[PDB]
């Protein structure tokens, strides 16, 4: 149902046919050289519309993708020709190196012109293609920008990259290579802020969204049970605590919000201590286990004496 | 003065004898074939005491490290050998490969025991060598362990790299290839976080953190002169504010405390502006800029009405 913009680099390369596939559905392969146009295929599977905008320096434009001379040139053009043929609008921005603070500033305004003119839901940043540096930028950038415009705007910041240097192999240069997503990781920060808030100030609405986002990536592990994670009733106590804190309140009923917002706690830290162990995850536990743990041993520390 | 780890990965690779030099200080360079390592030259020159740590894969660790027969490895064990001589330890911690999120998730907590049991002022990522897939994922988790580390340790944290991709070639497989410092980029989220906190609820002690670190990064442009920002003066004006705001107070001190707020920004907007010229290779002016504004257009928005 959404729309999905995918951002890409364009840097010289052989691009090598390759079976992309999202690490979470192995099942579904698509072979291209271009991670970009894989994971659009996938959205679109999805139901998705899916707009792709690649970063190219005019060097790499000229020197590489026009040179009739080069085979890896050649196919990577007719990839790039022939993704109008899947509905998928194209377009290119050209930008500098980024050799200095300057030009790497430049690249950081035209994606906030992306980000800004983009009316979609969703953005993906594929790392896949591209050099390391502008990878690693831009990686670096994407929490910067998320904090921006998920605000600003109504958009939905992924980063993702085909990890061809693990993947498996097929044939000559033909490789079986995951996806990989690591939006969670770009945001862990966010478990840690709300923590911090709710422990010096009473502050409970980052924790409430974390309580969210959290509960969109456990429900990835169908094994893991909601009914006992129950993170709903853990923002409504939340929210109600925090009003408890806005008025003054009798001691007592601060208490009996703890003492409720305890007891889902820790039948929530059970559940998913064991559902995390008995599934493969395809996001990382560690984190969630700790903002748990902290959480209950915070909320018990705001006992009243 | 400063005790300092650089951490890095380590790939197999041809590892070329490099012209590597910090983009602030083209004068200064370092001949070397790992980024690390030069790194580690330019800290030590500082007078800094400076430990090196290695993350290698089994496999790259057997097949090429500690290959008697691969001249690569050779000299980079060589390299590394030597630099021992000028009391810089060099070790090397095993990681798996980050085939899957579980993986990647070891390689975090390999990461967070280095940094935990690191008992140094400083840690340098240097994301020049090892896979591309390490030092995206690396750079994108890097902000959540610079938080953890903020309020655990207090420790400073950098994120370095070679541009080879866009360096000078003087001979044949002889690169001129600056160092960058991207560090800042990271931070950036620090003026969102602030910034939110400030606005939501009226809390300033991430402000004040953050406007000590940007006169930090401002002194790196020695023709700005810090006492033009005023930023001492903000800090107590700021927690006078949110002290105000704590119990009720008469509306006057507060717009009194607004005003006051606003005009110190004003100076430190101007000397900023005017200043952060010729700083193409120190820092990105943008941000700070939009953090001052920003900042000024919210503690105005606090006036009563």
Not at 190 to 212: C, N, P, Q, S, W
Not at 236 to 251: A, D, H, M, N, V
Not at 253 to 270: G, P, Q, T, V
Not at 279 to 291: G, H, M, R, T, V
Request: hydrophobic content about 40%; glycine content about 4%.
């Amino acid at each position: 149902m959404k729309k999905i913009l995918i951002v890409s680099f364009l840097g010289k390369g052989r691009y090598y046919e390759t079976f992309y596939y999202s690490i979470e559905h192995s099942e579904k392969m698509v072979k291209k050289r271009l991670s970009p146009l894989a994971n659009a295929i996938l959205e679109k599977e999805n139901g998705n519309d899916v707009e792709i905008i690649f970063f190219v320096t005019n060097e790499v434009k000229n020197e590489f993708l026009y040179d009739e001379n080069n085979e890896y040139a050649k196919n990577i053009l007719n990839e790039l020709n022939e993704i109008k043929n899947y509905g998928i609008k194209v377009s290119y921005r050209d930008i500098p190196k980024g050799k200095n603070y300057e030009e790497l500033e430049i690249i950081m305004e035209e994606i906030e012109k992306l980000l800004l003119d983009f009316k979609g839901n969703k953005v993906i940043f594929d790392l896949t293609h591209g050099l390391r540096h502008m990878a690693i930028f831009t990686s670096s950038t994407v929490f910067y920008f998320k904090n921006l415009m998920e605000k600003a705007n109504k958009l939905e910041m992924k980063i993702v990259y085909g990890a061809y240097e693990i993947g498996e192999e097929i044939e000559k240069n033909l490789k079986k290579v995951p996806i990989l997503d690591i939006t969670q990781t770009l945001e862990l920060s966010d478990l840690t802020i709300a923590l911090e808030e709710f422990e010096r100030y009473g502050i409970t609405e980052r924790m409430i969204i974390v309580l969210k986002n959290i509960q969109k990536i456990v429900a990835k592990n169908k094994l893991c049970n909601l009914n006992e994670l129950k993170f709903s009733s853990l923002s409504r106590e939340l929210k109600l605590f925090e009003e408890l804190l806005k008025i003054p309140s009798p001691p007592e009923k601060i208490a009996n919000s703890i003492y409720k917002i305890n007891d889902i706690l820790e039948s929530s830290i059970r559940e998913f201590k064991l559902c995390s162990k008995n599934s493969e995850n395809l996001f990382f536990i560690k984190p969630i286990q700790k903002f748990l743990v902290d959480f209950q041993k915070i909320v018990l520390e705001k006992l009243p004496l």
